[PDB]
Amino acid sequence: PFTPQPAPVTGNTYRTYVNDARTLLNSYGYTMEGKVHIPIDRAMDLIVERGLPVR
């Protein structure tokens, strides 16, 4: 029983949407109505800094 040759897949994969959104998370940018993409780990620091409400 030799090592199986797993059939090389085709069609679109999850990676295109995943790295598109990974670009969309960092690296600033614009959209339809939002004023600027504040990046994750900068927007993350801002959302802890202005805080979530507690109780």
Partner 1 sequence: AQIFPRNANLLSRLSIFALVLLVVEGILILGVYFRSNYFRQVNVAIEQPVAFSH
CA pseudo-torsion sign 11, 12, 15, 19: positive
Query: What is the closest distance, in whole angstroms, from the C-beta atom of residue 50 to partner 1 in the complex?
Result: 42
Query: What is the closest distance, in whole angstroms, from the C-beta atom of residue 40 to partner 1 in the complex?
Result: 29
Rank residues 3 and 12 by Cβ distance to partner 1 and give the closer one: 3
Cα angle vertex 40, ends 27, 16, to 5°? 60
How many residues in the shown chain lie near partner 1 by CB under 8 A? 4
Q: Is 34 in the site for partner 1 (CB under 8 A)?
A: no
Distance, CA of 4 to CA of 30 (rounded, Å): 46
Where on the chain is the footprint of partner 1 (CB under 8 A)? Answer: 1-4
